[PDB]
Amino acid sequence: VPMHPFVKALQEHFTAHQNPEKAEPMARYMKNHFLFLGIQTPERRQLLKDIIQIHTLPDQKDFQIIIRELWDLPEREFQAAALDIMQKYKKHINETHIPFLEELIVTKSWWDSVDSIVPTFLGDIFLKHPELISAYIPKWIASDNIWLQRAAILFQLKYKQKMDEELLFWIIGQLHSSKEFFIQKAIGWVLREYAKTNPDVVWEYVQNNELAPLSKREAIKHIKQNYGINN
DNA sequence: CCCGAAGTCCG
DNA sequence: CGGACTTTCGGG
Ligand SMILES: Cc1cnc(N)c2[nH]cnc12
Numbered sequence: 001v002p003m004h005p006f007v008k009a010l011q012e013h014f015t016a017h018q019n020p021e022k023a024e025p026m027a028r029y030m031k032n033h034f035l036f037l038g039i040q041t042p043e044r045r046q047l048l049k050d051i052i053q054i055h056t057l058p059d060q061k062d063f064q065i066i067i068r069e070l071w072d073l074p075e076r077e078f079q080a081a082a083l084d085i086m087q088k089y090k091k092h093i094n095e096t097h098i099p100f101l102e103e104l105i106v107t108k109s110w111w112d113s114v115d116s117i118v119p120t121f122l123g124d125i126f127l128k129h130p131e132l133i134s135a136y137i138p139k140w141i142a143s144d145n146i147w148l149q150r151a152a153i154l155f156q157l158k159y160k161q162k163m164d165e166e167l168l169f170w171i172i173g174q175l176h177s178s179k180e181f182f183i184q185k186a187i188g189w190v191l192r193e194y195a196k197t198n199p200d201v202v203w204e205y206v207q208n209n210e211l212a213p214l215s216k217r218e219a220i221k222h223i224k225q226n227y228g229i230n231n
Numbered sequence: 232c233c234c235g236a237a238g239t240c241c242g
Numbered sequence: 243c244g245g246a247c248t249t250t251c252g253g254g
Binding site: 028029030031111112115185189192193222 | 236237
Binding site for chain 3: 025029040041042213214217
């Protein structure tokens with residue numbers, strides 16, 4: 001079965017504009033886990049738009065197929081484009097897509113893909129269907145996969161007043177002893193972000209519960225100005 | 232335009 | 243460990 005024509009067209013058009021000189025530092029930035037074509041976001045967005053203009057966005061029946069096929073291509077720009085495409089199908093994504101999103105998280109995994117899946121796509125799903133959180137979060141925390149653990153921490157990133165504080169702090173407590181940078185830093189980020197909404201709760205939490213030094217320092221980067229640094 | 236959100240280098 | 247500094251991206 002041939003590659004979906006939309007994917008083939010995107011592959012041809014991106015490849016015709018590759019920049020091997022830029023690809024080298026771009027690949028190093030992601031610690032050489034991926035090949036890059038060397039196309040930065042502004043041009044990558046225009047090249048995708050070119051293909052949508054010519055071919056039209058595929059029928060929704062092929063949404064998951066297109067994303068998978070792009071996920072399977074070697075160069076990282078194809079996963080970035082896949083996430084751009086998934087946003088275009090946003091109004092068609094719902095709770096039945098959680099496993100599909102899980103599988104994207106755990107394949108071709110790094111912060112650049114995971115952080116564009118979790119707080120937006122999964123965040124929106126669990127905001128509408130909070131009763132489904134306990135069908136996934138416990139498994140994610142218990143798994144060997146650091147990106148699922150990071151997903152458990154960051155899905156509520158943007159919740160603001162809708163943050164489930166007890167849940168957030170329970171998740172952090174489960175993962176606070178992790179030596180993994182991407183876990184320590186995710187804890188730092190979610191606390192720093194939630195502190196923009198409820199600084200007193202975050203301050204009390206970090207002063208009275210164990211965290212990796214990195215996590216605590218990142219959490220209070222801004223709010224330490226409000227409370228002061230005791231001698 | 233601005234600001235706030237991985238990476239290297241150094242003590 | 244953590245400060246100083248870097249580019250790229252998204253949002254205001
Ligand atoms: C995630 C992140 C944080 N801070 C910066 N100064 C960055 N520059 C590029 N990504 C960044």
